[PDB]
């Protein structure tokens, strides 16, 4: 039922169908919420990456934000204009740009934590903490499977 | 660990992080494969929707392909030029465009079934049929949860 090469294929039994539907609805709702505090999904991701990893290159940010280097560069310098991040040439390689979050960026993290609280309360309604962890593990397994292609 | 409002938040424990990573890697690999037979992810989706549901409006296609009505309209008339679909005004409402798959579209379905076979063999490696069904059910639950916002 979940095999596109089968005659029994049904999108409603196809994990990637519901994955894409979830990605789209989640993205739309997050864009709506973050707009209220002058943010968006790419800047939400960049801020979380900087908050977890400290100083980060454009390349590392791009990997974890799922965006092109050009997109991340534009977003990063926009955030720097707004005061949310600062940048500096990497000492190892002047070609490589290092980005770090500012105290204003951290305040923006607090704002995005508050404004999305209800969405994340609702998102996993009906699922236990073990079920959520199992969802997470299975998604990571699929990701690693796709990295072998 | 999976709660963005928590001090313990870690993206690697956050279902939406792995969901987005999977969506991106899956999309890139599918684009690569479908390009070999002159297709892409949006046309793969449109063909599956038409193959399952028969004659379908632009709106229904757009819902299930996760795209804007304008995007789907352009894709649909491109596919019609290439002979993969045909269109007709809906009898109920001349404003509404009905799309149906052609025998050439069905042949393209067979080609996309063949060219992605290995990706789908690899995608669920290490997961049993029950685990895949549980992944599917949990994703549908999250989707329905997000529809309440
Ligand atoms: O791109 C994918 O394979 C997932 C997907 C999203 N909408 C779809 C409609 C029909 C079949 C698959 C999909
Ligand atoms: O948009 C999301 O919430 C998922 C996501 C993708 N990359 C991320 C990096 C850090 C935190 C969340 C995400």
Numbering used by the authors:
A (entry chain A), B (entry chain A): 19 to 167
Task: Kindly provide excerpts from the paper associated with this entry.
We characterize the binding of IAA to MarR-family regulators from both iac and iad loci. Most characterized MarR-family regulators function as repressors by binding to an operator sequence upstream of the genes they control. When a relevant ligand binds the MarR repressor, it releases from DNA, allowing gene expression. The structures of MarRs from representatives of each auxin degradation operon type establish that each has distinct IAA-binding pockets.
